[PDB]
PDB file of C-alpha atoms and ligand atoms in Angstrom:
ATOM      1  CA  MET A   1      86.114  79.892 -32.511  1.00  0.00           C
ATOM      2  CA  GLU A   2      85.306  74.880 -29.232  1.00  0.00           C
ATOM      3  CA  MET A   3      89.060  75.339 -28.760  1.00  0.00           C
ATOM      4  CA  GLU A   4      90.537  71.973 -29.525  1.00  0.00           C
ATOM      5  CA  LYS A   5      89.733  72.345 -33.193  1.00  0.00           C
ATOM      6  CA  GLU A   6      91.172  75.954 -33.000  1.00  0.00           C
ATOM      7  CA  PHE A   7      94.250  74.707 -31.131  1.00  0.00           C
ATOM      8  CA  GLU A   8      94.831  72.126 -33.858  1.00  0.00           C
ATOM      9  CA  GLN A   9      94.674  74.890 -36.698  1.00  0.00           C
ATOM     10  CA  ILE A  10      97.151  77.213 -34.946  1.00  0.00           C
ATOM     11  CA  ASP A  11      99.416  74.084 -34.596  1.00  0.00           C
ATOM     12  CA  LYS A  12      99.266  73.191 -38.204  1.00  0.00           C
ATOM     13  CA  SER A  13      99.541  76.727 -38.976  1.00  0.00           C
ATOM     14  CA  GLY A  14     102.226  77.059 -36.276  1.00  0.00           C
ATOM     15  CA  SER A  15     101.077  80.598 -35.458  1.00  0.00           C
ATOM     16  CA  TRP A  16     101.466  80.547 -31.647  1.00  0.00           C
ATOM     17  CA  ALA A  17     104.132  83.267 -31.791  1.00  0.00           C
ATOM     18  CA  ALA A  18     101.742  85.362 -33.929  1.00  0.00           C
ATOM     19  CA  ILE A  19      98.755  84.992 -31.582  1.00  0.00           C
ATOM     20  CA  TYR A  20     100.941  85.854 -28.768  1.00  0.00           C
ATOM     21  CA  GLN A  21     102.357  89.059 -30.183  1.00  0.00           C
ATOM     22  CA  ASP A  22      98.756  90.123 -30.925  1.00  0.00           C
ATOM     23  CA  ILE A  23      97.949  89.782 -27.208  1.00  0.00           C
ATOM     24  CA  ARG A  24     101.142  91.699 -26.284  1.00  0.00           C
ATOM     25  CA  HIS A  25     100.007  94.466 -28.640  1.00  0.00           C
ATOM     26  CA  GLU A  26      96.480  94.982 -27.305  1.00  0.00           C
ATOM     27  CA  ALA A  27      97.293  94.526 -23.586  1.00  0.00           C
ATOM     28  CA  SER A  28      96.646  97.321 -21.221  1.00  0.00           C
ATOM     29  CA  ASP A  29      99.212  99.887 -20.122  1.00  0.00           C
ATOM     30  CA  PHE A  30      98.347 101.660 -16.829  1.00  0.00           C
ATOM     31  CA  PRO A  31     100.720 103.687 -14.620  1.00  0.00           C
ATOM     32  CA  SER A  32     103.183 102.108 -12.140  1.00  0.00           C
ATOM     33  CA  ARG A  33     104.491 105.269 -10.463  1.00  0.00           C
ATOM     34  CA  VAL A  34     104.744 103.974  -6.866  1.00  0.00           C
ATOM     35  CA  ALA A  35     106.819 100.960  -8.011  1.00  0.00           C
ATOM     36  CA  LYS A  36     109.364 103.360  -9.710  1.00  0.00           C
ATOM     37  CA  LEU A  37     110.004 105.623  -6.748  1.00  0.00           C
ATOM     38  CA  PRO A  38     113.717 105.523  -5.776  1.00  0.00           C
ATOM     39  CA  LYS A  39     112.765 104.462  -2.098  1.00  0.00           C
ATOM     40  CA  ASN A  40     111.435 101.123  -3.675  1.00  0.00           C
ATOM     41  CA  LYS A  41     114.200 100.195  -5.806  1.00  0.00           C
ATOM     42  CA  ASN A  42     115.334  97.413  -3.471  1.00  0.00           C
ATOM     43  CA  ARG A  43     111.754  95.990  -3.310  1.00  0.00           C
ATOM     44  CA  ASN A  44     111.577  94.971  -7.018  1.00  0.00           C
ATOM     45  CA  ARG A  45     113.279  91.892  -8.172  1.00  0.00           C
ATOM     46  CA  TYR A  46     113.097  92.843 -11.877  1.00  0.00           C
ATOM     47  CA  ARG A  47     113.368  96.333 -13.262  1.00  0.00           C
ATOM     48  CA  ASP A  48     110.769  95.573 -15.945  1.00  0.00           C
ATOM     49  CA  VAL A  49     107.922  93.897 -13.982  1.00  0.00           C
ATOM     50  CA  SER A  50     105.893  96.291 -11.796  1.00  0.00           C
ATOM     51  CA  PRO A  51     102.352  96.337 -10.322  1.00  0.00           C
ATOM     52  CA  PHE A  52      99.927  98.913 -11.670  1.00  0.00           C
ATOM     53  CA  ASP A  53      98.992 101.650  -9.183  1.00  0.00           C
ATOM     54  CA  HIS A  54      95.389 101.043  -9.506  1.00  0.00           C
ATOM     55  CA  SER A  55      95.456  97.286  -8.507  1.00  0.00           C
ATOM     56  CA  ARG A  56      98.560  97.068  -6.263  1.00  0.00           C
ATOM     57  CA  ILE A  57      98.318  95.547  -2.758  1.00  0.00           C
ATOM     58  CA  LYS A  58      99.030  98.121  -0.042  1.00  0.00           C
ATOM     59  CA  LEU A  59     100.764  97.112   3.180  1.00  0.00           C
ATOM     60  CA  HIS A  60      99.085  98.466   6.341  1.00  0.00           C
ATOM     61  CA  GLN A  61     101.959 100.564   7.532  1.00  0.00           C
ATOM     62  CA  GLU A  62     102.570 104.315   7.393  1.00  0.00           C
ATOM     63  CA  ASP A  63     106.330 104.074   6.720  1.00  0.00           C
ATOM     64  CA  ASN A  64     106.228 102.537   3.206  1.00  0.00           C
ATOM     65  CA  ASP A  65     103.188 100.622   1.984  1.00  0.00           C
ATOM     66  CA  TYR A  66     104.834  99.184  -1.166  1.00  0.00           C
ATOM     67  CA  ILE A  67     105.095  95.517  -2.197  1.00  0.00           C
ATOM     68  CA  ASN A  68     105.414  94.159  -5.771  1.00  0.00           C
ATOM     69  CA  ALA A  69     101.958  92.426  -5.743  1.00  0.00           C
ATOM     70  CA  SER A  70      98.649  92.850  -7.666  1.00  0.00           C
ATOM     71  CA  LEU A  71      94.971  91.955  -7.037  1.00  0.00           C
ATOM     72  CA  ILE A  72      93.437  90.299 -10.016  1.00  0.00           C
ATOM     73  CA  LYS A  73      89.626  90.593  -9.620  1.00  0.00           C
ATOM     74  CA  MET A  74      87.566  88.196 -11.918  1.00  0.00           C
ATOM     75  CA  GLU A  75      84.160  89.634 -11.603  1.00  0.00           C
ATOM     76  CA  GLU A  76      82.193  87.035 -13.612  1.00  0.00           C
ATOM     77  CA  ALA A  77      84.149  84.042 -12.231  1.00  0.00           C
ATOM     78  CA  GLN A  78      83.855  85.398  -8.647  1.00  0.00           C
ATOM     79  CA  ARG A  79      87.553  84.698  -8.018  1.00  0.00           C
ATOM     80  CA  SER A  80      90.307  86.955  -6.682  1.00  0.00           C
ATOM     81  CA  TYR A  81      94.025  86.104  -6.827  1.00  0.00           C
ATOM     82  CA  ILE A  82      97.063  88.042  -5.545  1.00  0.00           C
ATOM     83  CA  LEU A  83      99.991  87.598  -7.964  1.00  0.00           C
ATOM     84  CA  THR A  84     103.423  88.570  -6.563  1.00  0.00           C
ATOM     85  CA  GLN A  85     107.147  88.120  -7.280  1.00  0.00           C
ATOM     86  CA  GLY A  86     109.238  85.626  -5.347  1.00  0.00           C
ATOM     87  CA  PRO A  87     110.312  87.285  -2.075  1.00  0.00           C
ATOM     88  CA  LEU A  88     113.704  89.067  -1.869  1.00  0.00           C
ATOM     89  CA  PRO A  89     115.973  88.827   1.276  1.00  0.00           C
ATOM     90  CA  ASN A  90     114.703  92.210   2.396  1.00  0.00           C
ATOM     91  CA  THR A  91     110.974  91.686   1.537  1.00  0.00           C
ATOM     92  CA  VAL A  92     110.299  88.329   3.258  1.00  0.00           C
ATOM     93  CA  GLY A  93     108.763  90.182   6.215  1.00  0.00           C
ATOM     94  CA  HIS A  94     106.624  92.311   3.861  1.00  0.00           C
ATOM     95  CA  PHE A  95     105.450  89.086   2.129  1.00  0.00           C
ATOM     96  CA  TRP A  96     104.114  87.498   5.330  1.00  0.00           C
ATOM     97  CA  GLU A  97     102.610  90.849   6.447  1.00  0.00           C
ATOM     98  CA  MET A  98     100.576  90.822   3.199  1.00  0.00           C
ATOM     99  CA  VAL A  99      99.455  87.219   3.777  1.00  0.00           C
ATOM    100  CA  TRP A 100      98.289  88.172   7.300  1.00  0.00           C
ATOM    101  CA  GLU A 101      96.575  91.477   6.363  1.00  0.00           C
ATOM    102  CA  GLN A 102      94.733  90.078   3.301  1.00  0.00           C
ATOM    103  CA  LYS A 103      93.430  87.018   5.285  1.00  0.00           C
ATOM    104  CA  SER A 104      94.816  84.488   2.796  1.00  0.00           C
ATOM    105  CA  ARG A 105      94.509  80.813   3.453  1.00  0.00           C
ATOM    106  CA  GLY A 106      97.008  79.491   0.886  1.00  0.00           C
ATOM    107  CA  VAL A 107     100.298  80.352  -0.848  1.00  0.00           C
ATOM    108  CA  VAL A 108     101.023  78.786  -4.276  1.00  0.00           C
ATOM    109  CA  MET A 109     104.751  78.530  -5.256  1.00  0.00           C
ATOM    110  CA  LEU A 110     105.597  77.491  -8.832  1.00  0.00           C
ATOM    111  CA  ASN A 111     109.434  77.748  -8.832  1.00  0.00           C
ATOM    112  CA  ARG A 112     112.371  76.180  -7.004  1.00  0.00           C
ATOM    113  CA  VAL A 113     114.546  78.401  -4.787  1.00  0.00           C
ATOM    114  CA  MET A 114     117.509  77.711  -7.126  1.00  0.00           C
ATOM    115  CA  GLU A 115     117.019  77.223 -10.902  1.00  0.00           C
ATOM    116  CA  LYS A 116     119.483  77.407 -13.862  1.00  0.00           C
ATOM    117  CA  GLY A 117     122.307  77.717 -10.990  1.00  0.00           C
ATOM    118  CA  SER A 118     120.980  81.063  -9.670  1.00  0.00           C
ATOM    119  CA  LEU A 119     118.674  82.166  -6.876  1.00  0.00           C
ATOM    120  CA  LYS A 120     115.075  82.747  -7.975  1.00  0.00           C
ATOM    121  CA  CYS A 121     113.690  83.674  -4.546  1.00  0.00           C
ATOM    122  CA  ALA A 122     114.631  83.791  -0.883  1.00  0.00           C
ATOM    123  CA  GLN A 123     114.182  80.771   1.415  1.00  0.00           C
ATOM    124  CA  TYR A 124     111.188  82.407   3.061  1.00  0.00           C
ATOM    125  CA  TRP A 125     109.709  79.505   5.096  1.00  0.00           C
ATOM    126  CA  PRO A 126     111.245  77.209   7.744  1.00  0.00           C
ATOM    127  CA  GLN A 127     112.520  73.808   6.739  1.00  0.00           C
ATOM    128  CA  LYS A 128     112.396  72.102  10.157  1.00  0.00           C
ATOM    129  CA  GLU A 129     109.743  72.053  12.856  1.00  0.00           C
ATOM    130  CA  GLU A 130     112.128  73.002  15.700  1.00  0.00           C
ATOM    131  CA  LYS A 131     113.638  75.948  13.734  1.00  0.00           C
ATOM    132  CA  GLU A 132     111.041  78.642  13.473  1.00  0.00           C
ATOM    133  CA  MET A 133     111.498  82.020  11.739  1.00  0.00           C
ATOM    134  CA  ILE A 134     110.851  85.362  13.186  1.00  0.00           C
ATOM    135  CA  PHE A 135     110.496  88.529  11.041  1.00  0.00           C
ATOM    136  CA  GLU A 136     111.411  91.303  13.296  1.00  0.00           C
ATOM    137  CA  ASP A 137     110.436  94.164  10.995  1.00  0.00           C
ATOM    138  CA  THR A 138     106.870  93.167  10.709  1.00  0.00           C
ATOM    139  CA  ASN A 139     106.479  91.242  14.069  1.00  0.00           C
ATOM    140  CA  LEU A 140     105.534  87.897  12.813  1.00  0.00           C
ATOM    141  CA  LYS A 141     106.489  84.257  13.693  1.00  0.00           C
ATOM    142  CA  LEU A 142     106.350  81.430  11.292  1.00  0.00           C
ATOM    143  CA  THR A 143     106.559  77.726  12.232  1.00  0.00           C
ATOM    144  CA  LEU A 144     106.609  74.553  10.072  1.00  0.00           C
ATOM    145  CA  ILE A 145     103.833  72.221  11.375  1.00  0.00           C
ATOM    146  CA  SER A 146     103.959  69.362   8.826  1.00  0.00           C
ATOM    147  CA  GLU A 147     105.146  68.544   5.325  1.00  0.00           C
ATOM    148  CA  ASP A 148     103.680  66.241   2.635  1.00  0.00           C
ATOM    149  CA  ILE A 149     106.163  65.528  -0.171  1.00  0.00           C
ATOM    150  CA  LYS A 150     104.726  64.045  -3.384  1.00  0.00           C
ATOM    151  CA  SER A 151     106.267  63.311  -6.774  1.00  0.00           C
ATOM    152  CA  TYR A 152     105.415  66.476  -8.440  1.00  0.00           C
ATOM    153  CA  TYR A 153     104.621  68.796  -5.509  1.00  0.00           C
ATOM    154  CA  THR A 154     104.915  69.310  -1.746  1.00  0.00           C
ATOM    155  CA  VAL A 155     102.111  70.635   0.631  1.00  0.00           C
ATOM    156  CA  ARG A 156     103.185  72.196   3.965  1.00  0.00           C
ATOM    157  CA  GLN A 157     101.061  73.239   6.914  1.00  0.00           C
ATOM    158  CA  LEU A 158     102.507  76.490   8.507  1.00  0.00           C
ATOM    159  CA  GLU A 159     101.509  78.411  11.500  1.00  0.00           C
ATOM    160  CA  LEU A 160     101.656  82.306  11.284  1.00  0.00           C
ATOM    161  CA  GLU A 161     101.498  84.129  14.498  1.00  0.00           C
ATOM    162  CA  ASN A 162     100.947  87.853  14.847  1.00  0.00           C
ATOM    163  CA  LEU A 163     103.326  88.749  17.775  1.00  0.00           C
ATOM    164  CA  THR A 164     101.545  91.831  18.438  1.00  0.00           C
ATOM    165  CA  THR A 165      98.228  90.143  19.254  1.00  0.00           C
ATOM    166  CA  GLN A 166      99.225  86.460  19.609  1.00  0.00           C
ATOM    167  CA  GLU A 167      96.534  85.486  17.096  1.00  0.00           C
ATOM    168  CA  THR A 168      97.531  82.504  14.966  1.00  0.00           C
ATOM    169  CA  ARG A 169      96.429  81.252  11.798  1.00  0.00           C
ATOM    170  CA  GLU A 170      97.062  78.030   9.633  1.00  0.00           C
ATOM    171  CA  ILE A 171      98.491  78.753   6.250  1.00  0.00           C
ATOM    172  CA  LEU A 172      98.757  76.061   3.557  1.00  0.00           C
ATOM    173  CA  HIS A 173     101.886  76.134   1.279  1.00  0.00           C
ATOM    174  CA  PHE A 174     101.303  74.518  -2.121  1.00  0.00           C
ATOM    175  CA  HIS A 175     104.711  74.021  -3.850  1.00  0.00           C
ATOM    176  CA  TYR A 176     104.883  72.755  -7.437  1.00  0.00           C
ATOM    177  CA  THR A 177     108.411  71.392  -7.633  1.00  0.00           C
ATOM    178  CA  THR A 178     108.786  69.966 -11.157  1.00  0.00           C
ATOM    179  CA  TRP A 179     108.370  72.805 -13.697  1.00  0.00           C
ATOM    180  CA  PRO A 180     111.425  72.431 -15.986  1.00  0.00           C
ATOM    181  CA  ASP A 181     114.136  74.909 -16.038  1.00  0.00           C
ATOM    182  CA  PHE A 182     113.407  75.579 -19.740  1.00  0.00           C
ATOM    183  CA  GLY A 183     110.161  75.461 -21.597  1.00  0.00           C
ATOM    184  CA  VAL A 184     106.892  74.093 -20.223  1.00  0.00           C
ATOM    185  CA  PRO A 185     105.767  70.600 -19.115  1.00  0.00           C
ATOM    186  CA  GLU A 186     104.981  68.146 -21.891  1.00  0.00           C
ATOM    187  CA  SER A 187     101.624  67.165 -20.405  1.00  0.00           C
ATOM    188  CA  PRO A 188      99.286  69.289 -18.243  1.00  0.00           C
ATOM    189  CA  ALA A 189      98.124  66.320 -16.145  1.00  0.00           C
ATOM    190  CA  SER A 190     100.384  67.001 -13.173  1.00  0.00           C
ATOM    191  CA  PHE A 191      99.694  70.756 -13.253  1.00  0.00           C
ATOM    192  CA  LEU A 192      95.899  70.145 -13.348  1.00  0.00           C
ATOM    193  CA  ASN A 193      96.354  67.573 -10.572  1.00  0.00           C
ATOM    194  CA  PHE A 194      98.159  70.267  -8.555  1.00  0.00           C
ATOM    195  CA  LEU A 195      95.484  72.894  -9.337  1.00  0.00           C
ATOM    196  CA  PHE A 196      92.590  70.651  -8.077  1.00  0.00           C
ATOM    197  CA  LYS A 197      94.509  70.019  -4.826  1.00  0.00           C
ATOM    198  CA  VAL A 198      94.766  73.668  -4.256  1.00  0.00           C
ATOM    199  CA  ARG A 199      90.835  73.978  -4.972  1.00  0.00           C
ATOM    200  CA  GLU A 200      90.024  71.086  -2.606  1.00  0.00           C
ATOM    201  CA  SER A 201      91.926  72.644   0.240  1.00  0.00           C
ATOM    202  CA  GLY A 202      89.495  75.646   0.336  1.00  0.00           C
ATOM    203  CA  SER A 203      92.338  78.089  -0.405  1.00  0.00           C
ATOM    204  CA  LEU A 204      90.537  79.509  -3.488  1.00  0.00           C
ATOM    205  CA  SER A 205      87.106  79.864  -1.930  1.00  0.00           C
ATOM    206  CA  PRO A 206      85.321  83.241  -1.167  1.00  0.00           C
ATOM    207  CA  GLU A 207      85.253  82.579   2.601  1.00  0.00           C
ATOM    208  CA  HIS A 208      89.000  83.284   2.724  1.00  0.00           C
ATOM    209  CA  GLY A 209      91.078  86.204   1.462  1.00  0.00           C
ATOM    210  CA  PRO A 210      92.624  85.812  -2.015  1.00  0.00           C
ATOM    211  CA  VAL A 211      95.230  83.087  -2.555  1.00  0.00           C
ATOM    212  CA  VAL A 212      98.802  84.402  -2.955  1.00  0.00           C
ATOM    213  CA  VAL A 213     100.585  82.880  -5.988  1.00  0.00           C
ATOM    214  CA  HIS A 214     104.157  83.455  -7.159  1.00  0.00           C
ATOM    215  CA  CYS A 215     107.006  82.309  -9.292  1.00  0.00           C
ATOM    216  CA  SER A 216     110.215  84.314  -9.802  1.00  0.00           C
ATOM    217  CA  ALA A 217     108.656  87.419 -11.462  1.00  0.00           C
ATOM    218  CA  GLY A 218     104.996  86.577 -10.740  1.00  0.00           C
ATOM    219  CA  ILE A 219     103.728  86.827 -14.320  1.00  0.00           C
ATOM    220  CA  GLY A 220     104.629  83.692 -16.287  1.00  0.00           C
ATOM    221  CA  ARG A 221     103.953  80.388 -14.538  1.00  0.00           C
ATOM    222  CA  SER A 222     101.729  82.393 -12.123  1.00  0.00           C
ATOM    223  CA  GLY A 223      99.667  83.680 -15.020  1.00  0.00           C
ATOM    224  CA  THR A 224      99.266  80.143 -16.371  1.00  0.00           C
ATOM    225  CA  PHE A 225      97.868  78.984 -12.986  1.00  0.00           C
ATOM    226  CA  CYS A 226      95.123  81.769 -12.621  1.00  0.00           C
ATOM    227  CA  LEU A 227      94.262  81.658 -16.366  1.00  0.00           C
ATOM    228  CA  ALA A 228      93.626  77.910 -16.377  1.00  0.00           C
ATOM    229  CA  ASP A 229      91.545  78.234 -13.016  1.00  0.00           C
ATOM    230  CA  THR A 230      89.349  81.140 -14.220  1.00  0.00           C
ATOM    231  CA  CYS A 231      88.689  79.629 -17.672  1.00  0.00           C
ATOM    232  CA  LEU A 232      87.607  76.311 -16.124  1.00  0.00           C
ATOM    233  CA  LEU A 233      85.372  78.101 -13.600  1.00  0.00           C
ATOM    234  CA  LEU A 234      83.681  80.071 -16.411  1.00  0.00           C
ATOM    235  CA  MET A 235      83.204  76.820 -18.494  1.00  0.00           C
ATOM    236  CA  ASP A 236      81.673  74.945 -15.570  1.00  0.00           C
ATOM    237  CA  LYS A 237      79.254  77.977 -15.010  1.00  0.00           C
ATOM    238  CA  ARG A 238      77.869  79.379 -18.289  1.00  0.00           C
ATOM    239  CA  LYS A 239      74.959  78.169 -20.290  1.00  0.00           C
ATOM    240  CA  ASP A 240      77.176  77.849 -23.349  1.00  0.00           C
ATOM    241  CA  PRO A 241      80.705  76.568 -22.529  1.00  0.00           C
ATOM    242  CA  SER A 242      82.024  77.215 -25.980  1.00  0.00           C
ATOM    243  CA  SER A 243      81.737  80.877 -25.213  1.00  0.00           C
ATOM    244  CA  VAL A 244      84.880  80.907 -23.065  1.00  0.00           C
ATOM    245  CA  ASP A 245      87.576  82.614 -25.095  1.00  0.00           C
ATOM    246  CA  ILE A 246      90.965  82.128 -23.457  1.00  0.00           C
ATOM    247  CA  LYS A 247      92.508  85.179 -25.239  1.00  0.00           C
ATOM    248  CA  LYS A 248      89.832  87.500 -23.929  1.00  0.00           C
ATOM    249  CA  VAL A 249      90.107  86.086 -20.409  1.00  0.00           C
ATOM    250  CA  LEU A 250      93.875  86.692 -20.571  1.00  0.00           C
ATOM    251  CA  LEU A 251      93.429  90.262 -21.755  1.00  0.00           C
ATOM    252  CA  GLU A 252      91.004  90.988 -18.936  1.00  0.00           C
ATOM    253  CA  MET A 253      93.584  89.674 -16.429  1.00  0.00           C
ATOM    254  CA  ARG A 254      96.227  91.803 -17.961  1.00  0.00           C
ATOM    255  CA  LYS A 255      94.237  94.910 -16.924  1.00  0.00           C
ATOM    256  CA  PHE A 256      95.293  94.022 -13.350  1.00  0.00           C
ATOM    257  CA  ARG A 257      98.960  92.951 -13.824  1.00  0.00           C
ATOM    258  CA  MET A 258     101.330  93.426 -16.780  1.00  0.00           C
ATOM    259  CA  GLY A 259     102.995  90.625 -18.715  1.00  0.00           C
ATOM    260  CA  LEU A 260     100.872  87.616 -17.731  1.00  0.00           C
ATOM    261  CA  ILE A 261     102.072  84.690 -19.894  1.00  0.00           C
ATOM    262  CA  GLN A 262     105.640  85.382 -20.860  1.00  0.00           C
ATOM    263  CA  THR A 263     106.066  83.086 -23.903  1.00  0.00           C
ATOM    264  CA  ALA A 264     104.056  81.589 -26.740  1.00  0.00           C
ATOM    265  CA  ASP A 265     104.806  78.129 -25.280  1.00  0.00           C
ATOM    266  CA  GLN A 266     103.155  79.204 -22.026  1.00  0.00           C
ATOM    267  CA  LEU A 267     100.299  80.400 -24.147  1.00  0.00           C
ATOM    268  CA  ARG A 268      99.942  77.017 -25.845  1.00  0.00           C
ATOM    269  CA  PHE A 269     100.337  75.149 -22.528  1.00  0.00           C
ATOM    270  CA  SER A 270      97.666  77.229 -21.127  1.00  0.00           C
ATOM    271  CA  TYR A 271      95.175  76.069 -23.897  1.00  0.00           C
ATOM    272  CA  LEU A 272      96.145  72.435 -23.387  1.00  0.00           C
ATOM    273  CA  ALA A 273      95.523  72.691 -19.658  1.00  0.00           C
ATOM    274  CA  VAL A 274      92.056  74.171 -20.174  1.00  0.00           C
ATOM    275  CA  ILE A 275      91.100  71.713 -22.925  1.00  0.00           C
ATOM    276  CA  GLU A 276      92.315  68.680 -21.009  1.00  0.00           C
ATOM    277  CA  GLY A 277      90.980  70.237 -17.911  1.00  0.00           C
ATOM    278  CA  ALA A 278      87.546  70.690 -19.432  1.00  0.00           C
ATOM    279  CA  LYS A 279      87.874  67.211 -20.730  1.00  0.00           C
ATOM    280  CA  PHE A 280      88.297  65.810 -17.159  1.00  0.00           C
ATOM    281  CA  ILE A 281      85.587  67.670 -15.624  1.00  0.00           C
ATOM    282  CA  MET A 282      83.125  66.157 -18.092  1.00  0.00           C
ATOM    283  CA  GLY A 283      84.404  62.613 -17.976  1.00  0.00           C
ATOM    284  CA  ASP A 284      85.313  62.530 -21.733  1.00  0.00           C
TER     285      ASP A 284
HETATM  286  C1  JFJ B   1      77.925  71.715 -16.047  1.00  0.00           C
HETATM  287  N1  JFJ B   1      79.152  72.163 -16.841  1.00  0.00           N
HETATM  288  C2  JFJ B   1      79.967  70.989 -17.447  1.00  0.00           C
HETATM  289  C3  JFJ B   1      81.184  71.423 -18.223  1.00  0.00           C
HETATM  290  C4  JFJ B   1      81.164  71.567 -19.618  1.00  0.00           C
HETATM  291  C5  JFJ B   1      82.306  71.973 -20.336  1.00  0.00           C
HETATM  292  C6  JFJ B   1      83.507  72.248 -19.678  1.00  0.00           C
HETATM  293  C7  JFJ B   1      83.522  72.103 -18.288  1.00  0.00           C
HETATM  294 CL1  JFJ B   1      84.985  72.436 -17.467  1.00  0.00          CL
HETATM  295  C8  JFJ B   1      82.392  71.701 -17.571  1.00  0.00           C
END
């Protein structure tokens, strides 16, 4: 089945929870053996969210190459994303090592450091220009260059220096600051506005390494972001736009990381974003 009509039928039939459990049922299950090794226990924020072996990002070090991060490769859309958990106090150096080694231009952050009174990720970037961070385990320096605070999001320019070679690179930090503690946003307008800013910047384009996107577990809000981007890119591209099926795109993505889209509300929000997003692109 075009979608808006379909979205409207599910609504009157109120079957979002049913659609969603169907997706949960047919999703892929691939092994995650490296994530479960005892030497990695302190590298996983949540016991139940792990990268598959086959698609995990490997750090370039002999000691321990493990980070909780996955490469989602969308062959037809010609997009790659890295989806990862929010960094832990002991994996902040691993996080920036990955950014460096994978040649990423942008980091997308969809949570606040504290939510519902509890820490959701480490404070992994510097908050003042004159107070840089140094990650001694991986030999990296990170400096705040500028900050651009808007109503719904903040964009930061950062400088990442490899101390081993003194190469530097500009990294862009795209921080969506207004996702509610519970539920999903009422309208997708601000989230779409945020997504297009990230596109404009060049951070999603094939001349750079894959964008790194995270929330607390890296599957819920993060899944919403790459699902809405890939569906819109497929709808702009094909001969017949009505042949983009958001459930099939989601199942394809779930071959590369488990659990993408954590609730039926996130599933519904995701439809609204694509519909309204496809509405904007065509003027109507
Ligand atoms: C050239 N493609 C225009 C179009 C149609 C339907 C949806 C989108 Cl996003 C874009």
